[PDB]
Amino acid sequence: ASVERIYQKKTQLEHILLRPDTYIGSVELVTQQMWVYDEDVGINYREVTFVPGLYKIFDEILVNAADNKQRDPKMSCIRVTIDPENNLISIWNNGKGIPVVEHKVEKMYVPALIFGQLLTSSNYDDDEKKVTGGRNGYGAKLCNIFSTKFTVETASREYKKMFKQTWMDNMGRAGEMELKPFNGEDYTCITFQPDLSKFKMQSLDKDIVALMVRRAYDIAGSTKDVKVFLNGNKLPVKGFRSYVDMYLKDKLDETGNSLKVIHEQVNHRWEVCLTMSEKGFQQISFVNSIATSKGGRHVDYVADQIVTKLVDVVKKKNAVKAHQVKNHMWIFVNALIENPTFDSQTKENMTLQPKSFGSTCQLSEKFIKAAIGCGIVESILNWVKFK
Amino acid sequence: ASVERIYQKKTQLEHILLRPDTYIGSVELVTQQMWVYDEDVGINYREVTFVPGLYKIFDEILVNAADNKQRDPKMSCIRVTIDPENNLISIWNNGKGIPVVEHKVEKMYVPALIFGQLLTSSNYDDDEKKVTGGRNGYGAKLCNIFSTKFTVETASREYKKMFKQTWMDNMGRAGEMELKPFNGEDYTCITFQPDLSKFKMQSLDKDIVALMVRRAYDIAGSTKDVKVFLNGNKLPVKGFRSYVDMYLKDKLDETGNSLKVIHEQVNHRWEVCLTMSEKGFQQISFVNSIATSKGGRHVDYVADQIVTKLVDVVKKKNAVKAHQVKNHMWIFVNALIENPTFDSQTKENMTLQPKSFGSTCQLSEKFIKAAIGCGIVESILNWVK
Ligand SMILES: Nc1ncnc2c1ncn2[C@@H]1O[C@H](COP(=O)(O)OP(=O)(O)NP(=O)(O)O)[C@@H](O)[C@H]1O
Ligand SMILES: Nc1ncnc2c1ncn2[C@@H]1O[C@H](COP(=O)(O)OP(=O)(O)NP(=O)(O)O)[C@@H](O)[C@H]1O
Ligand SMILES: [Mg+2]
Ligand SMILES: [Mg+2]
Numbered sequence: 001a002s003v004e005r006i007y008q009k010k011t012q013l014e015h016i017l018l019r020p021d022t023y024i025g026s027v028e029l030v031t032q033q034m035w036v037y038d039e040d041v042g043i044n045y046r047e048v049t050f051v052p053g054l055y056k057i058f059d060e061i062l063v064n065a066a067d068n069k070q071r072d073p074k075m076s077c078i079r080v081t082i083d084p085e086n087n088l089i090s091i092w093n094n095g096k097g098i099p100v101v102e103h104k105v106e107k108m109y110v111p112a113l114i115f116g117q118l119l120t121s122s123n124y125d126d127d128e129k130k131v132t133g134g135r136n137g138y139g140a141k142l143c144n145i146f147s148t149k150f151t152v153e154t155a156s157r158e159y160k161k162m163f164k165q166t167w168m169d170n171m172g173r174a175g176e177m178e179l180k181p182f183n184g185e186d187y188t189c190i191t192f193q194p195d196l197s198k199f200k201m202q203s204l205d206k207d208i209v210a211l212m213v214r215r216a217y218d219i220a221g222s223t224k225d226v227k228v229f230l231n232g233n234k235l236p237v238k239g240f241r242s243y244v245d246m247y248l249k250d251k252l253d254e255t256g257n258s259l260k261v262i263h264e265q266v267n268h269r270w271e272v273c274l275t276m277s278e279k280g281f282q283q284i285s286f287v288n289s290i291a292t293s294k295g296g297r298h299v300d301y302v303a304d305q306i307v308t309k310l311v312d313v314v315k316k317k318n319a320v321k322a323h324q325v326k327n328h329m330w331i332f333v334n335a336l337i338e339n340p341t342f343d344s345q346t347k348e349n350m351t352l353q354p355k356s357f358g359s360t361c362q363l364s365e366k367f368i369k370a371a372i373g374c375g376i377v378e379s380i381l382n383w384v385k386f387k
Numbered sequence: 388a389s390v391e392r393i394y395q396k397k398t399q400l401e402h403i404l405l406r407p408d409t410y411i412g413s414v415e416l417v418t419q420q421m422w423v424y425d426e427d428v429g430i431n432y433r434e435v436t437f438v439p440g441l442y443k444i445f446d447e448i449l450v451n452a453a454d455n456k457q458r459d460p461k462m463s464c465i466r467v468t469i470d471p472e473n474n475l476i477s478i479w480n481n482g483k484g485i486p487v488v489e490h491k492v493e494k495m496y497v498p499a500l501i502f503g504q505l506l507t508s509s510n511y512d513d514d515e516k517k518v519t520g521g522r523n524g525y526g527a528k529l530c531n532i533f534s535t536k537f538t539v540e541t542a543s544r545e546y547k548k549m550f551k552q553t554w555m556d557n558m559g560r561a562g563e564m565e566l567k568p569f570n571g572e573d574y575t576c577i578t579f580q581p582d583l584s585k586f587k588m589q590s591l592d593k594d595i596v597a598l599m600v601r602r603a604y605d606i607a608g609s610t611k612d613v614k615v616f617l618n619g620n621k622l623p624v625k626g627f628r629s630y631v632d633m634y635l636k637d638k639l640d641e642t643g644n645s646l647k648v649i650h651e652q653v654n655h656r657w658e659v660c661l662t663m664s665e666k667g668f669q670q671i672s673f674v675n676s677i678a679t680s681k682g683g684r685h686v687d688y689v690a691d692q693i694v695t696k697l698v699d700v701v702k703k704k705n706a707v708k709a710h711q712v713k714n715h716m717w718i719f720v721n722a723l724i725e726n727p728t729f730d731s732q733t734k735e736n737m738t739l740q741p742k743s744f745g746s747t748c749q750l751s752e753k754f755i756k757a758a759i760g761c762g763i764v765e766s767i768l769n770w771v772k
Contacts, residue, residue: 004492010506010524012399018511019523021728022409026738105391119397124405136406137397280710323667327714341408344731351413386770 012118016145017170020198024142025052025346027199035247035284036210037217043246048207051199056346057146058089058212059291060139061190065093066223066289067132068188071122072096079229080216084204089212090191097186098154100161100179109177111163115140115152115190116174129338129358131269133288138345140190144171146199147192154188170195215291217243222286222334240265240334244273247284247332253375254278260374262367270361272302273332276375281326285333287340287350296342296350298335302361306331309368314380324383328376335361399505403532404557404585410529411447412439412733414586422634422671423597424604430633435594438586443733444533445476445599446678447526448577452480453610453676454519455575458509459483466616467603471591476599477578484543484573487550487566496564498550502527502539503561516745518656518723520675525732527577531558533586534579541575557582602678604630609673609721627658627721634671634719641665649757656723657748659689663762664717672720674727674737683729683737685722689748693718696755700764706771715763722748 010018020027031049038044062080069075075095082089098111106113114120114137121137123130144150144167155162162182166175196202204212213230220228220235221243228235237243241263251259253276262274283299285292292298307325314320338358341351354360397405407414418436425431449467456462462482469476485498493500493507501507501524508524510517531537531554542549549569553562583589600617607615607622608630615622624630628650638646640663649661670686672679679685694712701707725745728738741747750758 003486003488003497004490005512006509007490007497007501008508008511009493009500009504010511012506015506015524021738022523022731025730026728028740028743030740099390099394101390103390103394106396110390110394113396114394117396119399119402121395122393124395124397125392136409137402279708280714321666323714327667327710341413343412343733343735344409346730348730351408353415353417356415383770386772 013145013171016142017198020053020146023138023345024056024146027051027053029200034211035214036207037214038206038210039213043214043217048211050208050211051201052346053146054194054196054199054201054208055211055215057143057192057194059215060143061089061091061192062215062219063133063288063290064140064190065091065188066219066226067134068093068095069223069226070130070132070288073225075226077227077229078216078219079232080212081231082204082209082212084209087193087196087204088191089194089204090189092187092189094185094187096158097156097188098163100154100156100159100163100182109163109179111152111154112165112174112177115144115150116165116167116171117141126339131288131336131338131358133290133340133347135340135342135347136345141171142345143190143192146170146195148195149193151191152188153191155182155184155186157183157186170198217246218286218291219289222289240271240332241273244284244332248273248275251275260370262370262374264364264367266361266363267359269336269359270302271334272361272363272367274306274367274371274374275330276379277328277330282330283333285331285335287335287337287347290347290350292348292350294349297352297354298337298350298357299331299333301354301357302333302363303329303331305363306368306371310372310376310380313372313377314384317377317381318384320380320384324380325376328379400532400558403529407440407533407585410525410732411443411533414438414440416587421598422601423594424600425593425597430601430604430636435598437595437598438588439733440533441581441583441586441588441595442598442602444530444579444581446602447530448476448478448579449602449606450520450676451527451577452478452575453606453613454521455480455482456610456613457517457519457675460612463612464614464616465606466619467599468618469591469596469599471596474580474583474591475578476581476591477576479574479576481572481574483545484575485541485550487541487543487546487548487569496550498539498541499552499561499564502531502537503552503554503558504528513726516725518675518725518745520677520734522727522729522734523732528558529732530577530579530581533557533582535582536580538578539575540578542569542571542573544570544573557585604633605673605678606676609676627652627719628660631660631671631719635662647761649754649761651751651754653748653750654746656746657689658721659748659750659754660719661693661758661761662717663715665715668713669717670720672718672722674722674724674734677727677734677737679735679737681736684739684741685724685737685744686718686720688741688744689720689750690716690718692750693755693758697759697764697767700759701768701771704768707767711767711770712763715766 072095079092123134151166153164164178220237459482466479538553540551549567551565607624
């Protein structure tokens with residue numbers, strides 16, 4: 001009844017733990033069909049039960065690793081370790097480390113600042129037109145906050161130093177900072193034990209591991225010239241087309257014939273695959289190696305030029321609407337977008353208008369022709385016949 | 388390229404202005420089809436060009452007014468003023484005012500705290516199972532931050548005082564707090580001048596007004612026993628079914644016949660209308676008077692029990708998929724949900740699972756029967772043939 005009990009102020013850290021949803025997604029169970037990678041089965045679509053926020057904190061660190069390839073093209077490798085019985089995840093990358101030096105304005109070492117303080121980022125100057133996935137200065141701190149133990153190790157040959165420090169108890173405490181002389185090949189390694197109590201979980205079970213492994217395959221398929229290892233084993237992905245092939249390799253439509261798959265690497269920032277869908281519009285897409293599971297204007301931009309060209313082919317053969325065409329399409333898009341926007345930190349839907357992408361993606365006349373002859377025009381014409 | 392230039396830390400306020408999208412949505416132009424209310428023809432679906440974030444800061448204040456009906460059910464009225472020429476918006480409501488008193492913990496007057504300080508809310512104790520739209524403690528400060536001038540006035544007969552304070556320059560400064568004795572009918576009035584430069588706009592033009600006006604119609608239809616006024620004109624909505632009718636006034640399908648509409652007020656927290664769609668699945672829904680324009684589990688919870696009963700009807704008469712059924716559905720849902728969750732501050736998609744809703748919505752067998760007899764079972768059954 002008290003004014004002080006009714007009206008409350010929260011610190012930023014308190015607010016994240018109290019209201020996790022707009023930061024990392026739901027911290028409750030969801031049961032739905034998802035693409036996952038099962039041991040001994042590979043890529044497959046099945047019902048899974050998982051906590052989105054746990055999936056996301058892993059994603060934040062993984063995308064950070066991919067981002068470093070854009071910062072340093074000499075980077076060649078990402079190594080992911082998932083150890084359920086010790087509740088341990090590690091993500092390692094090479095290329096240039098984080099400067100191991102005191103930040104003259106914030107008065108702490110750079111790695112401690114950008115992993116241990118909210119709203120810290122190298123991505124706050126949008127006069128630079130970057131195709132990194134990082135935008136907001138939260139992601140790594142979010143993983144820290146939802147971890148019981150969160151270790152940052154980064155080595156900077158330029159500064160001849162190596163940094164290592166561990167946070168604990170939801171970024172509430174930090175152990176001792178370790179600084180050692182260094183003169184090798186740079187790397188960064190983030191090792192964390194997710195706070196499964198925040199997710200009402202007891203361990204990294206089969207389903208969340210299958211999702212995390214598939215996400216590592218996503219990275220292998222969406223990045224260029226980065227080898228990806230999962231628990232010491234190299235992942236056999238070479239390019240986005242070979243990644244898409246894992247989804248469609250033996251796939252048949254419902255009459256029994258194999259799916260017709262249309263591909264174009266339109267340019268160095270856009271790659272597209274199209275086939276037929278029997279369950280409504282489907283899209284699997286990436287922006288700067290972020291899995292945009294709810295799509296966005298990058299998907300609309302590519303799909304719409306297919307749809308309008310197909311509605312024009314169907315009209316020649318007569319009343320059909322664009323949503324009808326789109327419901328027969330399964331599209332794959334891998335895109336690099338400058339300074340993308342999203343309506344949430346989880347970055348599931350990319351909202352930037354095409355005029356601001358920094359590149360274009362006009363599908364070739366070769367691609368469009370093959371799209372006309374891939375079964376979508378057929379199914380539509382049988383429906384208007386059977387009217 | 389110095390380390391201090393590369394790696395930067397932002398205050399919360401700086402971060403909101405630098406990265407508005409996760410707080411209020413896009414601050415750039417968007418062109419798409421929207422339901423609006425034009426001073427010409429009324430509710431209608433047409434292409435508009437508008438800035439989502441400007442639309443959103445208006446919504447935050449409007450939903451706050453609607454929230455006060457849950458706080459004080461004797462509240463009866465909301466009045467909205469939109470004045471493009473002076474770039475001024477006001478939202479007024481009656482019912483209980485904000486307590487005009489010094490907060491013993493934060494050591495400022497309550498209205499100053501909850502309109503001038505980030506992460507402040509009456510909605511942070513989830514042991515109270517409330518059906519208010521406010522959850523995060525941002526909305527009103529976001530409107531303040533994206534305004535050149537932002538004025539709060541609230542009168543509390545209980546505290547026998549009236550409060551008034553004005554912020555300016557993106558919540559960068561505040562004027563003086565004005566306190567006067569008060570002994571009339573409580574009210575709260577929020578008046579703001581949106582910072583149109585932040586939205587790269589020149590004035591509150593035709594399209595953004597039509598969106599704001601339809602949103603005021605939304606409030607009149609989603610709330611109970613609240614009259615809604617816009618520029619002194621009462622909005623002629625009484626109950627959710629009458630609001631849905633404004634969408635269905637032009638009631639003809641593509642065959643020429645009048646639209647068949649199935650309705651049920653399931654309980655005090657759920658009201659559902661269903662009609663047919665020829666443009667794919669459509670949903671218009673609200674959670675605690677939030678316009679959930681991207682839907683959510685409240686929509687799924689309702690639509691799915693319609694779909695599953697229809698899929699069971701087509702089997703009797705035969706391989707059909709659920710998306711096929713859904714594509715012929717245009718559904719309206721007005722729900723009150725306890726402590727809802729959302730993907731983003733903009734609250735366009737409600738993510739809370741049904742087991743946590745705090746109520747159920749099992750559609751009546753009469754509703755289901757009428758839904759079986761609406762043409763959706765018909766067209767699909769000829770399709771499988
Ligand atoms: N593996 C890494 N290698 C090099 N720099 C890194 C790495 N991970 C993080 N960083 C740096 O640490 C900063 C903070 O990371 P993070 O908190 O994830 O924010 P962000 O990536 O910039 N934006 P976001 O992820 O959208 O919230 C980044 O901006 C990078 O400068
Ligand atoms: N018109 C109003 N009448 C009464 N109380 C109000 C009114 N507007 C705001 N408040 C109070 O001010 C607080 C701050 O509002 P706001 O910043 O919108 O946060 P919120 O509504 O609690 N959550 P959110 O909108 O999801 O960020 C609310 O929790 C209310 O208690
Ligand atoms: Mg990041
Ligand atoms: Mg609010």
